[model samples]
Target: DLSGKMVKQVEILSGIVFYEIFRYRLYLISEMSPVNIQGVDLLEGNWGTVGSVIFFKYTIDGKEKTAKDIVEAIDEETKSVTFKIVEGDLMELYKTFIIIVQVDTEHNSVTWTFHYEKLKEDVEEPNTLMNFCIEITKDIETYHL
Candidate 1:
């Protein structure tokens, strides 16, 4: 499966530059993005710390599914946020998915890594997702600039 693996990398090392980027990620997946338009709920947790859980529903494949992801760990010294998604109907596409975001201030680098395992052997690894993350990272950098 190593040959089938796909990885996307983007770097943004400015503080607060990726605020909207992070918010967008939270909004898109968490329950907050549609609160004003669809009357959902405001995001009920912190963005960069552990013990954070974002709850929401999303439409995937024209079917609505509820999702909740928990922030499993955070490294303040390393400026990293780690989250785990479990049993979310929408996130079920990934047999195992882990999100690791790190900010390297000394090197002025912020990195977002999404590691995932496809449920089926036939499912192709997600190169597009890596592209999406790169785009989002660029958006944050441009917005910061």
Candidate 2:
């Protein structure tokens, strides 16, 4: 399995609370206009709801990439979300790809976790993708602030 994780301490100085920011996930996702994100299209289901099919557009290393993923789960109390990739460029490389995000309400921190399986031995781990997630997190924080 290929895996990567990033933990970030929540910066609560901008009068924006973690809970408040968490609720804007769909906006950050569907609206796309944020830093690190080029575009997002909702293919099925309602945004912010489980089973939603969404397409993401982003650039990495100056190359544009796209992915289609399904919203697997969402927990409001823990401010957590999970997405399972069903198709797109990732599917061409990995057998499976999943992204999980969780926020610690007490400590005001957040974590992004990635789990995946490679289709072959030569496949590289998704280190840059993890960094991309971190960058997106920072962008989200900046947006909220």
Candidate 3:
């Protein structure tokens, strides 16, 4: 049932500047969402630290979907944040799901790693989700540059 590891990388043109923008959790979620993506509300908890819950709404292929995710880990030194999906459409399709985001300012890139377990044989891997994250990173990069 495990889907294995999925990795996606997004180039951050303004590395340090992007890092600074990425480090602001609440602001990142509130401002960085690409067109058609929105952070509808903070259903629970704070934005930056671990254990914070964030609720998001977005349109994919003209269909609206929502999710509730909890911050599981954050490594300040590495500029990494991990989120576990506790509820939402992802939960409906995946038995377990977690997204790890790390920014390598030195390399001028941001990497997103996803680990998930599927609930059924027909469940597809989250390729679109990775693309969405990459798109958001680009939006953030553009905002700060």
Which is the leading candidate under TM-score?
3
Cα deviation of 106, candidate 3, in Å: 4.8
The runs of at least 3 residues in candidate 3 whose Cα sits more than 4 Å from the true structure, single-residue gaps closed, are 16-23, 27-30
TM-score of 1: 0.63
Relative to the true structure, candidate 2 reaches a TM of: 0.79
Clashes of 3: 0
Tens-digit lDDT string for candidate 2 (48-69): 7788888888788778788998
Ranking by TM-score: 3, 2, 1
| Runs off by more than 4 Å, candidate 2 | 1-35
Candidates ranked, most accurate by lDDT first: 3, 2, 1
Report the number of clashing residue pairs per model: 0, 0, 0
Residue pairs in clash, model 3:
none
lDDT of 3 by residue, 47-69 (tens): 57678787878876567788888
Candidate 1 C-alpha lDDT tens digits along 27-66: 5323233321122233546664566676645443345666
Query: Candidate 1 at 137: error in angstroms?
Result: 1.1
Total residue pair clashes for candidate 2: 0
lDDT of 3: 0.74
